[PDB]
mmCIF file of C-alpha atoms in Angstrom:
data_model
loop_
_atom_site.group_PDB
_atom_site.id
_atom_site.type_symbol
_atom_site.label_atom_id
_atom_site.label_comp_id
_atom_site.label_asym_id
_atom_site.label_seq_id
_atom_site.Cartn_x
_atom_site.Cartn_y
_atom_site.Cartn_z
ATOM 1 C CA UNK A 1 0.000 0.000 0.000
ATOM 2 C CA UNK A 2 2.890 2.420 0.598
ATOM 3 C CA UNK A 3 3.964 3.801 -2.769
ATOM 4 C CA UNK A 4 7.511 5.125 -3.659
ATOM 5 C CA UNK A 5 9.088 2.676 -1.288
ATOM 6 C CA UNK A 6 12.176 2.470 -3.485
ATOM 7 C CA UNK B 2 28.370 27.146 -24.135
ATOM 8 C CA UNK B 3 27.137 23.868 -22.682
ATOM 9 C CA UNK B 4 30.301 21.846 -22.158
ATOM 10 C CA UNK B 5 29.465 19.017 -19.764
ATOM 11 C CA UNK B 6 32.486 17.530 -17.980
ATOM 12 C CA UNK B 7 32.330 14.758 -15.393
ATOM 13 C CA UNK B 8 34.285 16.042 -12.414
ATOM 14 C CA UNK B 9 33.697 13.037 -10.154
ATOM 15 C CA UNK B 10 31.488 9.972 -10.219
ATOM 16 C CA UNK B 11 31.610 7.018 -7.847
ATOM 17 C CA UNK B 12 29.493 3.935 -7.328
ATOM 18 C CA UNK B 13 27.509 3.191 -4.158
ATOM 19 C CA UNK B 14 24.159 1.954 -2.963
ATOM 20 C CA UNK B 15 21.138 3.910 -4.182
ATOM 21 C CA UNK B 16 21.450 7.577 -3.404
ATOM 22 C CA UNK B 17 18.203 9.192 -2.359
ATOM 23 C CA UNK B 18 19.451 12.602 -1.129
ATOM 24 C CA UNK B 19 22.270 14.840 -2.306
ATOM 25 C CA UNK B 20 23.550 18.317 -1.434
ATOM 26 C CA UNK B 21 26.535 20.639 -2.052
ATOM 27 C CA UNK B 22 28.502 22.423 0.651
ATOM 28 C CA UNK B 23 28.591 26.169 -0.147
ATOM 29 C CA UNK B 24 32.292 26.822 0.686
ATOM 30 C CA UNK B 25 34.080 23.421 0.677
ATOM 31 C CA UNK B 26 34.217 21.324 -2.500
ATOM 32 C CA UNK B 27 32.056 18.661 -0.882
ATOM 33 C CA UNK B 28 28.957 16.707 -1.813
ATOM 34 C CA UNK B 29 26.786 14.887 0.722
ATOM 35 C CA UNK B 30 25.017 11.717 -0.388
ATOM 36 C CA UNK B 31 22.375 9.875 1.632
ATOM 37 C CA UNK B 32 21.770 6.223 0.722
ATOM 38 C CA UNK B 33 18.972 3.657 0.760
ATOM 39 C CA UNK B 34 21.231 1.533 2.924
ATOM 40 C CA UNK B 35 21.217 3.945 5.859
ATOM 41 C CA UNK B 36 24.721 5.176 5.076
ATOM 42 C CA UNK B 37 25.661 8.799 4.356
ATOM 43 C CA UNK B 38 28.871 9.978 2.643
ATOM 44 C CA UNK B 39 30.574 13.321 2.327
ATOM 45 C CA UNK B 40 32.985 13.400 -0.611
ATOM 46 C CA UNK B 41 35.517 15.986 -1.622
ATOM 47 C CA UNK B 42 34.792 15.886 -5.356
ATOM 48 C CA UNK B 43 37.970 17.750 -6.314
ATOM 49 C CA UNK B 44 40.407 15.415 -4.497
ATOM 50 C CA UNK B 45 38.050 12.420 -4.780
ATOM 51 C CA UNK B 46 38.587 11.414 -1.157
ATOM 52 C CA UNK B 47 35.876 10.870 1.470
ATOM 53 C CA UNK B 48 35.859 13.469 4.224
ATOM 54 C CA UNK B 49 33.456 11.584 6.493
ATOM 55 C CA UNK B 50 30.901 8.782 6.269
ATOM 56 C CA UNK B 51 28.454 7.385 8.790
ATOM 57 C CA UNK B 52 26.249 4.338 9.025
ATOM 58 C CA UNK B 53 23.375 6.377 10.435
ATOM 59 C CA UNK B 54 20.696 3.697 10.504
ATOM 60 C CA UNK B 55 19.703 0.506 8.685
ATOM 61 C CA UNK B 56 16.729 2.142 6.985
ATOM 62 C CA UNK B 57 16.789 4.402 3.919
ATOM 63 C CA UNK B 58 17.944 7.983 4.448
ATOM 64 C CA UNK B 59 15.898 9.912 1.866
ATOM 65 C CA UNK B 60 16.852 13.419 2.880
ATOM 66 C CA UNK B 61 20.063 15.181 3.671
ATOM 67 C CA UNK B 62 21.306 18.734 3.721
ATOM 68 C CA UNK B 63 24.323 20.706 4.877
ATOM 69 C CA UNK B 64 23.729 23.411 7.473
ATOM 70 C CA UNK B 65 27.063 25.099 6.740
ATOM 71 C CA UNK B 66 26.756 27.935 9.252
ATOM 72 C CA UNK B 67 26.560 25.408 12.095
ATOM 73 C CA UNK B 68 29.019 22.898 10.541
ATOM 74 C CA UNK B 69 26.271 20.271 10.456
ATOM 75 C CA UNK B 70 24.592 17.797 8.203
ATOM 76 C CA UNK B 71 20.940 17.067 8.923
ATOM 77 C CA UNK B 72 19.419 13.821 7.691
ATOM 78 C CA UNK B 73 16.014 12.147 7.762
ATOM 79 C CA UNK B 74 15.191 8.461 7.415
ATOM 80 C CA UNK B 75 12.491 5.799 7.108
ATOM 81 C CA UNK B 76 12.915 5.000 10.822
ATOM 82 C CA UNK B 77 10.981 8.290 11.288
ATOM 83 C CA UNK B 78 13.971 10.104 12.784
ATOM 84 C CA UNK B 79 15.824 13.346 12.102
ATOM 85 C CA UNK B 80 19.518 13.258 13.056
ATOM 86 C CA UNK B 81 22.088 16.056 12.993
ATOM 87 C CA UNK B 82 25.856 15.473 12.921
ATOM 88 C CA UNK B 83 28.777 17.854 13.177
ATOM 89 C CA UNK B 84 30.825 17.105 10.072
ATOM 90 C CA UNK B 85 34.096 18.254 11.639
ATOM 91 C CA UNK B 86 33.894 16.028 14.727
ATOM 92 C CA UNK B 87 31.306 13.409 13.846
ATOM 93 C CA UNK B 88 29.327 14.267 16.982
ATOM 94 C CA UNK B 89 25.627 13.426 16.811
ATOM 95 C CA UNK B 90 24.098 16.739 17.831
ATOM 96 C CA UNK B 91 20.485 15.598 18.039
ATOM 97 C CA UNK B 92 18.422 12.518 17.218
ATOM 98 C CA UNK B 93 14.629 12.640 17.472
ATOM 99 C CA UNK B 94 11.508 11.068 16.017
ATOM 100 C CA UNK B 95 10.051 13.769 13.768
ATOM 101 C CA UNK B 96 6.997 12.047 12.268
ATOM 102 C CA UNK B 97 5.199 8.739 12.771
ATOM 103 C CA UNK B 98 6.055 7.808 9.160
ATOM 104 C CA UNK B 99 8.741 8.176 6.482
ATOM 105 C CA UNK B 100 10.576 11.472 6.000
ATOM 106 C CA UNK B 101 10.676 12.383 2.278
ATOM 107 C CA UNK B 102 12.298 15.829 2.223
ATOM 108 C CA UNK B 103 14.112 18.336 4.396
ATOM 109 C CA UNK B 104 14.654 22.035 3.669
ATOM 110 C CA UNK B 105 16.627 24.565 5.672
ATOM 111 C CA UNK B 106 15.871 28.275 5.907
ATOM 112 C CA UNK B 107 18.593 30.448 4.341
ATOM 113 C CA UNK B 108 19.027 32.746 7.383
ATOM 114 C CA UNK B 109 16.718 31.708 10.225
ATOM 115 C CA UNK B 110 17.303 28.612 12.349
ATOM 116 C CA UNK B 111 14.465 26.642 10.804
ATOM 117 C CA UNK B 112 14.244 23.229 9.188
ATOM 118 C CA UNK B 113 11.170 21.845 7.413
ATOM 119 C CA UNK B 114 10.485 18.103 7.090
ATOM 120 C CA UNK B 115 7.856 16.675 4.762
ATOM 121 C CA UNK B 116 6.487 13.233 5.546
ATOM 122 C CA UNK B 117 4.211 10.347 4.581
ATOM 123 C CA UNK B 118 2.213 11.376 7.669
ATOM 124 C CA UNK B 119 0.617 14.033 5.387
ATOM 125 C CA UNK B 120 2.323 16.972 7.126
ATOM 126 C CA UNK B 121 5.155 19.434 7.019
ATOM 127 C CA UNK B 122 6.821 20.178 10.349
ATOM 128 C CA UNK B 123 8.948 23.199 11.286
ATOM 129 C CA UNK B 124 11.810 22.695 13.773
ATOM 130 C CA UNK B 125 13.866 25.477 15.382
ATOM 131 C CA UNK B 126 17.461 24.626 16.296
ATOM 132 C CA UNK B 127 17.794 27.722 18.534
ATOM 133 C CA UNK B 128 14.878 26.364 20.621
ATOM 134 C CA UNK B 129 16.295 22.890 21.254
ATOM 135 C CA UNK B 130 14.852 21.588 17.953
ATOM 136 C CA UNK B 131 11.339 22.252 19.233
ATOM 137 C CA UNK B 132 8.440 21.524 16.911
ATOM 138 C CA UNK B 133 7.201 25.060 16.308
ATOM 139 C CA UNK B 134 4.482 24.368 13.749
ATOM 140 C CA UNK B 135 2.741 21.551 11.895
ATOM 141 C CA UNK B 136 1.258 22.365 8.492
ATOM 142 C CA UNK B 137 -1.820 20.214 7.831
ATOM 143 C CA UNK B 138 -3.974 20.048 4.748
ATOM 144 C CA UNK B 139 -2.345 17.644 2.334
ATOM 145 C CA UNK B 140 -4.106 14.326 1.691
ATOM 146 C CA UNK B 141 -1.197 12.046 0.628
ATOM 147 C CA UNK B 142 2.564 11.811 1.165
ATOM 148 C CA UNK B 143 4.425 15.131 1.220
ATOM 149 C CA UNK B 144 7.299 14.389 -1.178
ATOM 150 C CA UNK B 145 9.176 17.687 -1.300
ATOM 151 C CA UNK B 146 9.511 20.950 0.637
ATOM 152 C CA UNK B 147 11.282 24.037 -0.569
ATOM 153 C CA UNK B 148 11.575 27.592 0.751
ATOM 154 C CA UNK B 149 11.004 30.440 -1.657
ATOM 155 C CA UNK B 150 14.523 31.878 -1.830
ATOM 156 C CA UNK B 151 13.131 35.358 -2.615
ATOM 157 C CA UNK B 152 10.736 35.266 0.339
ATOM 158 C CA UNK B 153 11.664 32.490 2.757
ATOM 159 C CA UNK B 154 8.776 33.429 5.041
ATOM 160 C CA UNK B 155 6.949 31.220 2.518
ATOM 161 C CA UNK B 156 7.622 27.683 1.289
ATOM 162 C CA UNK B 157 6.091 25.117 -1.030
ATOM 163 C CA UNK B 158 5.126 21.486 -0.418
ATOM 164 C CA UNK B 159 4.699 19.023 -3.296
ATOM 165 C CA UNK B 160 2.366 16.122 -2.618
ATOM 166 C CA UNK B 161 1.100 12.827 -4.081
ATOM 167 C CA UNK B 162 -2.395 14.331 -3.601
ATOM 168 C CA UNK B 163 -1.663 16.147 -6.923
ATOM 169 C CA UNK B 164 -1.263 19.592 -5.357
ATOM 170 C CA UNK B 165 1.419 22.053 -4.385
ATOM 171 C CA UNK B 166 0.603 24.110 -1.331
ATOM 172 C CA UNK B 167 2.355 27.348 -0.561
ATOM 173 C CA UNK B 168 2.394 28.387 3.075
ATOM 174 C CA UNK B 169 3.462 31.302 5.346
ATOM 175 C CA UNK B 170 5.446 30.531 8.511
ATOM 176 C CA UNK B 171 2.979 32.443 10.685
ATOM 177 C CA UNK B 172 -0.065 30.587 9.470
ATOM 178 C CA UNK B 173 -2.101 27.370 9.524
ATOM 179 C CA UNK B 174 -3.650 27.267 6.048
ATOM 180 C CA UNK B 175 -2.007 27.541 2.642
ATOM 181 C CA UNK B 176 -1.799 30.960 1.024
ATOM 182 C CA UNK B 177 -2.912 28.938 -1.981
ATOM 183 C CA UNK B 178 -3.207 25.432 -3.356
ATOM 184 C CA UNK B 179 -2.066 24.748 -6.892
ATOM 185 C CA UNK B 180 -4.044 22.083 -8.744
ATOM 186 C CA UNK B 181 -1.332 20.737 -10.999
ATOM 187 C CA UNK B 182 -3.359 18.413 -13.194
ATOM 188 C CA UNK B 183 -0.500 15.978 -12.626
ATOM 189 C CA UNK B 184 -2.848 13.181 -11.698
ATOM 190 C CA UNK B 185 -0.215 10.730 -10.477
ATOM 191 C CA UNK B 186 0.931 13.285 -7.895
ATOM 192 C CA UNK B 187 3.785 15.750 -7.412
ATOM 193 C CA UNK B 188 7.215 14.300 -6.491
ATOM 194 C CA UNK B 189 9.186 17.547 -6.499
ATOM 195 C CA UNK B 190 8.742 21.295 -6.346
ATOM 196 C CA UNK B 191 11.411 24.007 -6.846
ATOM 197 C CA UNK B 192 11.454 27.788 -7.192
ATOM 198 C CA UNK B 193 13.136 29.825 -9.894
ATOM 199 C CA UNK B 194 15.627 31.762 -7.810
ATOM 200 C CA UNK B 195 15.994 34.989 -9.794
ATOM 201 C CA UNK B 196 13.722 38.031 -9.359
ATOM 202 C CA UNK B 197 12.575 38.349 -13.002
ATOM 203 C CA UNK B 198 9.960 35.532 -12.893
ATOM 204 C CA UNK B 199 7.656 34.314 -10.099
ATOM 205 C CA UNK B 200 8.044 30.718 -11.264
ATOM 206 C CA UNK B 201 7.889 27.291 -9.620
ATOM 207 C CA UNK B 202 8.351 23.902 -11.234
ATOM 208 C CA UNK B 203 6.769 20.487 -10.513
ATOM 209 C CA UNK B 204 7.740 16.917 -11.479
ATOM 210 C CA UNK B 205 5.412 13.902 -11.552
ATOM 211 C CA UNK B 206 4.970 10.149 -12.010
ATOM 212 C CA UNK B 207 2.691 11.186 -14.896
ATOM 213 C CA UNK B 208 5.897 11.752 -16.914
ATOM 214 C CA UNK B 209 5.461 15.528 -17.045
ATOM 215 C CA UNK B 210 7.255 18.591 -15.688
ATOM 216 C CA UNK B 211 5.225 21.790 -15.350
ATOM 217 C CA UNK B 212 6.184 25.468 -14.927
ATOM 218 C CA UNK B 213 3.914 27.712 -12.865
ATOM 219 C CA UNK B 214 3.477 31.417 -12.344
ATOM 220 C CA UNK B 215 2.830 31.573 -8.601
ATOM 221 C CA UNK B 216 1.128 34.980 -8.803
ATOM 222 C CA UNK B 217 -1.560 33.987 -11.315
ATOM 223 C CA UNK B 218 -1.460 30.208 -10.651
ATOM 224 C CA UNK B 219 -1.247 29.544 -14.417
ATOM 225 C CA UNK B 220 0.690 26.769 -16.066
ATOM 226 C CA UNK B 221 3.287 28.476 -18.257
ATOM 227 C CA UNK B 222 4.691 25.326 -19.901
ATOM 228 C CA UNK B 223 4.589 21.527 -19.801
ATOM 229 C CA UNK B 224 7.821 19.682 -20.509
ATOM 230 C CA UNK B 225 7.391 16.199 -21.985
ATOM 231 C CA UNK B 226 9.927 13.549 -22.888
ATOM 232 C CA UNK B 227 10.769 11.472 -19.831
ATOM 233 C CA UNK B 228 9.702 7.819 -20.143
ATOM 234 C CA UNK B 229 9.287 6.988 -16.483
ATOM 235 C CA UNK B 230 8.621 8.764 -13.182
ATOM 236 C CA UNK B 231 10.225 12.216 -13.027
ATOM 237 C CA UNK B 232 12.020 12.292 -9.675
ATOM 238 C CA UNK B 233 12.947 16.000 -9.770
ATOM 239 C CA UNK B 234 13.142 19.094 -11.932
ATOM 240 C CA UNK B 235 14.953 22.281 -10.987
ATOM 241 C CA UNK B 236 15.851 25.668 -12.377
ATOM 242 C CA UNK B 237 19.603 26.105 -12.569
ATOM 243 C CA UNK B 238 20.317 29.117 -10.341
ATOM 244 C CA UNK B 239 22.590 30.802 -12.862
ATOM 245 C CA UNK B 240 22.213 29.233 -16.347
ATOM 246 C CA UNK B 241 19.038 29.550 -18.475
ATOM 247 C CA UNK B 242 18.234 25.853 -18.204
ATOM 248 C CA UNK B 243 16.065 23.395 -16.295
ATOM 249 C CA UNK B 244 17.561 20.087 -15.149
ATOM 250 C CA UNK B 245 15.398 17.014 -14.582
ATOM 251 C CA UNK B 246 16.005 13.350 -13.736
ATOM 252 C CA UNK B 247 13.910 10.249 -14.013
ATOM 253 C CA UNK B 248 13.482 6.575 -13.237
ATOM 254 C CA UNK B 249 14.061 6.222 -16.982
ATOM 255 C CA UNK B 250 17.765 6.515 -16.109
ATOM 256 C CA UNK B 251 18.298 9.888 -17.759
ATOM 257 C CA UNK B 252 19.043 13.477 -16.840
ATOM 258 C CA UNK B 253 17.537 16.010 -19.171
ATOM 259 C CA UNK B 254 18.637 19.591 -19.685
ATOM 260 C CA UNK B 255 15.931 21.902 -21.063
ATOM 261 C CA UNK B 256 16.101 25.434 -22.458
ATOM 262 C CA UNK B 257 14.282 27.578 -19.874
ATOM 263 C CA UNK B 258 12.987 29.985 -22.527
ATOM 264 C CA UNK B 259 11.757 27.664 -25.265
ATOM 265 C CA UNK B 260 11.137 24.755 -22.902
ATOM 266 C CA UNK B 261 12.654 22.342 -25.423
ATOM 267 C CA UNK B 262 15.141 19.637 -24.452
ATOM 268 C CA UNK B 263 18.763 20.616 -25.107
ATOM 269 C CA UNK B 264 20.581 17.492 -23.938
ATOM 270 C CA UNK B 265 19.700 14.022 -22.613
ATOM 271 C CA UNK B 266 22.362 12.218 -20.590
ATOM 272 C CA UNK B 267 22.498 8.582 -19.650
ATOM 273 C CA UNK B 268 25.238 8.574 -17.044
ATOM 274 C CA UNK B 269 25.018 4.796 -16.682
ATOM 275 C CA UNK B 270 23.965 4.583 -13.053
ATOM 276 C CA UNK B 271 20.377 3.413 -13.682
ATOM 277 C CA UNK B 272 17.443 5.351 -12.150
ATOM 278 C CA UNK B 273 17.892 8.965 -11.059
ATOM 279 C CA UNK B 274 16.449 10.060 -7.698
ATOM 280 C CA UNK B 275 17.886 13.383 -6.574
ATOM 281 C CA UNK B 276 19.650 16.599 -7.545
ATOM 282 C CA UNK B 277 21.764 19.422 -6.157
ATOM 283 C CA UNK B 278 23.053 22.616 -7.716
ATOM 284 C CA UNK B 279 26.061 24.422 -6.231
ATOM 285 C CA UNK B 280 24.725 27.195 -3.933
ATOM 286 C CA UNK B 281 26.627 29.942 -5.819
ATOM 287 C CA UNK B 282 27.207 28.362 -9.231
ATOM 288 C CA UNK B 283 30.856 27.426 -8.608
ATOM 289 C CA UNK B 284 32.058 25.922 -11.899
ATOM 290 C CA UNK B 285 28.352 25.490 -12.698
ATOM 291 C CA UNK B 286 28.491 22.265 -10.679
ATOM 292 C CA UNK B 287 25.446 19.991 -10.454
ATOM 293 C CA UNK B 288 25.232 16.573 -8.791
ATOM 294 C CA UNK B 289 22.707 13.767 -9.079
ATOM 295 C CA UNK B 290 22.147 10.537 -7.142
ATOM 296 C CA UNK B 291 21.109 7.284 -8.801
ATOM 297 C CA UNK B 292 20.467 3.584 -8.091
ATOM 298 C CA UNK B 293 24.155 2.798 -8.496
ATOM 299 C CA UNK B 294 25.970 5.912 -7.265
ATOM 300 C CA UNK B 295 26.315 9.630 -7.941
ATOM 301 C CA UNK B 296 27.885 11.995 -10.366
ATOM 302 C CA UNK B 297 29.190 15.551 -10.086
ATOM 303 C CA UNK B 298 29.205 17.376 -13.410
ATOM 304 C CA UNK B 299 30.504 20.773 -14.465
ATOM 305 C CA UNK B 300 28.031 22.143 -17.009
ATOM 306 C CA UNK B 301 30.816 24.312 -18.470
#
């Protein structure tokens, strides 16, 4: 669910 | 004339934050691995490096006037280190979620942090790093914070909620909210630093970069050409160009008058995440952080 994890 | 020379590039783990020191020939990099590095890019020797945490450090800036670096990481913490001694000056939980961006006021002792907790927080290092204000209103992760260099009583936040909000330090609601029409959100916001245009610039996962007049709220131009998420776009402080970088692995340089691409660089470090321009245009230095390291370039 968290986006931009990278 | 554009004459791009590589002054120093080195490989490392993914670099998420990057910044230039204003008076020493140093670049700070903050890595996904929890490590931070300060390199002298002229001698190509490390001045200091620290394993700050085991989580990603997405944000890092010099605070030159206090001889500090300030960093923020996915463990929710802001840490400050003296770069001459290595002393950890402060270490506190800033948000209950990831820190995406840190900005520091050009004269006043203020730091802003933008977070996945939907807020921007203002910290004052002359008041024991007290939380002096929380700016609430955004509805998704706050990806980028930037003071207006021409009026640093105001700052901008760029958000995955597809807006930029511009705020005044005294005040709890935005002076205005910019609806960007960048429907995959805003990853980055920057101000044009010179007094002849009231411009800001936004970068998005929707592959576009947009220029805004902050007085009228109009979109002046849309810059298209990146083939994956645009991580950042900035006005060069001195040269009439815009510099962007993307998960497509490229840096692009655009003419800031015609808004057409001038040069596309694949520096060979895979995806691009972050950017810094030298605070006073020394040798027209820029630096960018990527999946596989960083590069410092002289634009001419």
